[PDB]
From TrEMBL, chains A, B, C, D:
Gene Ontology annotations for the cellular component aspect, listed alphabetically: cell envelope; membrane
Membership in a protein family: Belongs to the bacterial solute-binding protein 3 family.
Listed transmembrane segments: none
Gene source species: Wolinella succinogenes (strain ATCC 29543 / DSM 1740 / CCUG 13145 / JCM 31913 / LMG 7466 / NCTC 11488 / FDC 602W) (Vibrio succinogenes)
Keywords from the UniProt entry: Signal
Domain Ionotropic glutamate receptor C-terminal: 4-227
Primary localisation category: other
Name of protein: BINDING COMPONENT OF ABC TRANSPORTER
The Solute-binding protein family 3/N-terminal domain, residue ranges: 4-227
Length: 233, 233, 233, 233, 234
């Protein structure tokens, strides 16, 4: 690769990709992508894309790599190759205040009179249909649209990857929601690239091992997952 | 690959693959293969094959994968590729009664007046050739035939993969054989696929890493290496 | 109604209604009926009554509503109308220490030696007969008489609505018995009024949802089901 | 009410009600009445009835409830009260083998050239008028009789409640018809009772809630909507 | 469950539920609902504009069939009429004069007896403000619109009322002069009332309500009145 590293993501998975107040795209994966560019001695470009355009975009060479906090699922892994996992994740729940009472398991929210909302075409959806099966399930176009349904009284509860939930609790959720943080799925996230390229994978993996033993990774992880400065966009 | 997942294996290797009383082939690898096929959204077609016909069956494109309790050796691995190890194993023995007495190690048993038996052309035959300088070694077409040879007055001791020993011990060698259980080799077991498809490898390694963290693999480990339920066929 | 709302209950079920110290009756249900009366602009009158005279007491205008932890069952529903459920409950078991080990459902405790005990003529009794075939079962007049035999040594297990088993646990059971938390049935508890009054229902259903979105329900709930300050009765 | 529960239904709406080989009527709606009569303490008498006579059979007191896959509408609700819905269904198409190709929405089958058919005076005919402007509409006496006009030459496509179609496909259709399963409407079906009984409502509505939270509704759902045993009939 | 016409009592001037068009017909989210409901029953709509303290008794007295006036389901009222499952959920909000919102985190920063607070007489807000406000002057007026004029006039500092009123008011006149403190302070389910002893008609209404929530009808009327601004050319 010469010139520039084109990375496609979709903004809105806090704290991985979000849109600035200035409209600039920032986050863990964005910093991850600057490092990669640097370590490759090459220019970074981001291409923003909707979740559903990510894999075809990659497969079609709209970009070279995906770094969107994407679950290494066996389905998707048939269309692209995944680098090794750089963070490990699972789905928790955000609930309206009050229905959290006496819940010992997620399983007793799997009730027919309850409405569960996530975003369409994502891990949590697939989790939701595997996990629940009683509760009504509705899906939406964004993480934001979806938690709004429960915030505004339209839904009872919201499911998503755990770090979106804890980012959210910090920025808006503390007062009005409750986070049931017990993880419900084992979801490694890796970067995806298109098949037929083992040389890239070699490079990507080593470059992952480096930052994980460099102290570089742990800084970024501190920045986006423990620290709270970032929250003023 | 679309349609079906063809898996070559050779039954005989308790608890990985054997055939039941009904005539169907079942066991650890089978449940793995079934799980694998489901993850690719595909049908499963086992292709039972004699051992010597497994690699060339594979390289010959008669099936896509070996799942036979195959050992990742440097010799084989010149001919095919292996996924990361799904289980680690090692060679042990069964001796007839009275034999187990006085022994401190394998070295005590490596004597000329004794005959050692094992399946021809297999992992054990190689450790046997390496480990034992003084003892007669005679090989057979199936593990069962090899054991029989010491269930009779014919051989003194049988060597094989340790897990087969522990299962046969529970199956038939209860009163008769004695199990010296000191692992004598380091034997990593792995799925093999033909060379020059690194994408399938990527998909295989990410899948093996799921079932070790899912609980899936764990549920299946118990089933076949602890449960004792499966002895009824 | 006029002048007084008359409530029909039997003190015993904890933490719903219990008599103590001063000989006053108190609990979640009482606190509920208290808010109900302020809402109507009436004065509360509590009419403590043995279980088996609640429904007859109701049909006979001994009192106007039954708020003492009652299951909305189809048998009882033939005889009175239920407001929509105010809480959802379920059978759990208190057992002696030792009994909990390796037990992987209530079902592996259904044995002709073991003795299940309960209060007579209550939802707990009917579930006892439905689930447990083999276990000797004995019945007593109160919840206390029944758990006694278990604490003391005569019977050895106890079955009742879960909220009780945790409440007992927090007062007297913590060193002594083991609580298999798992939910054995689905048991909605509702207020019961006599038939032929759809207006009082309409009113009762709206009152229920007010306190549910009011925070009022929630306060009472913490105060009785989580708060440990009350057990100082 | 005591003695028996009389239940009015029209056989043919697979898999809710249909006449079996011997000629007794079965299905999801019968098993559901069978649960009602057990819980009610009472015997069960099914009163089969032509559809345009059910509402008048109820009001007339020919039976006590209509469980028939009846859609809840405002028109109907003027004459009879409806319990809450027990299932939500949607209208869908059964078209001749071949003319499924190209199509993207139901609208491209709305050509003056094509003949659409369904049963007379039933919520499928109304959606059909509502949704089909051009195509010639013909109405018959029974679902079975209307489809029969696509199975032979006469008509082109068939409109009815999705479960009917999934059922018809698994029973006869696979090689003959094509099923576009995009639900075109949203219709909640409900049980009807004669107006004037608020107590039977309260009963019926709690009963529906039990079985939906119990496992019994789900038993009966897998049974008729999924399993396929039922066809041997 | 009747023949002839469906008669609906309402009090115009709770924007955007009910208002006078100025050609003098009453229009609003409630009227469109009342219009849908009447069609579904195959019957005619008559609106019976009524002043607020006369809605319930008019219903009991059989002057009309149902009240669709954005009325709060309350235990005290529910004693006298029956309510249908609520159809929209609302809370009280505050409209204040310019600047007066700076450095305020909650409603509590506004209790000063210095401050004067106004609303309409005998209405959800009036009872809420008496609960919530302990120090502030509370004055009352026959109409929502007479009430806000006092803060617009600078004879009072802030207006309290159902939140959807405030946003519609902010759009028409308030945008330059007042500021909407839009934190919801009550939990106020809104339902149609009818007289007691009629379970059938309740059955009918509850199922009609479920129908328009799942139709798209409800959402449509909702957008039309509560979100988009077109309705404002009275
Ligand atoms: N990691 C999840 C979240 C998607 C985030 C959508 N912006 C997935 O792979 O679907
Ligand atoms: N790992 C042993 C197992 C052989 C089993 C023969 N059925 C090998 O590689 O030869
Ligand atoms: N839920 C129980 C109540 C416990 C009995 C209280 N003394 C029942 O309805 O049978
Ligand atoms: N669900 C529709 C169709 C039932 C068809 C009866 N054979 C209705 O309520 O009319
Ligand atoms: N929700 C308010 C409506 C105000 C009506 C004013 N015309 C109430 O029920 O009091």
């Amino acid at each position: 690769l010469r010139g520039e590293l084109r990375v496609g993501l979709e903004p809105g998975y806090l704290p991985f990709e979000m849109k600035d107040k200035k409209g600039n795209v920032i986050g863990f994966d964005v910093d991850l992508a600057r490092e990669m560019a640097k370590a490759m001695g090459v220019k970074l470009k981001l291409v923003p894309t909707s979740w559903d355009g990510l894999i075809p975009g990659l497969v079609t060479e709209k970009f070279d790599i995906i770094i969107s906090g994407m679950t290494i699922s066996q389905e998707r892994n048939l269309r692209v190759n995944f680098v090794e996992p750089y963070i490990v994740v699972g789905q928790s729940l955000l609930v309206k205040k009050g229905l959290e009472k006496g819940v010992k398991s997620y399983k007793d929210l799997d009730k027919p009179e309850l409405t569960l909302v996530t975003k369409f075409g994502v891990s949590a959806e697939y989790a939701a249909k595997r996990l629940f099966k009683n509760a009504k399930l509705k899906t939406y176009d964004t993480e934001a649209e979806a938690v709004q349904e429960v915030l505004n009284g339209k839904a009872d509860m919201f499911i998503f990857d755990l770090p979106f939930n804890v980012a959210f609790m910090a920025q808006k959720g503390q007062g009005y929601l409750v986070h049931l943080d017990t993880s419900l799925t084992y979801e490694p996230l890796g970067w995806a690239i298109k098949k037929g390229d083992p040389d890239f994978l070699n490079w990507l993996n080593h470059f992952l091992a480096q930052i994980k033993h460099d102290g570089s990774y742990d800084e970024l992880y501190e920045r986006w997952f423990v620290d709270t400065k970032w929250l003023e966009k």
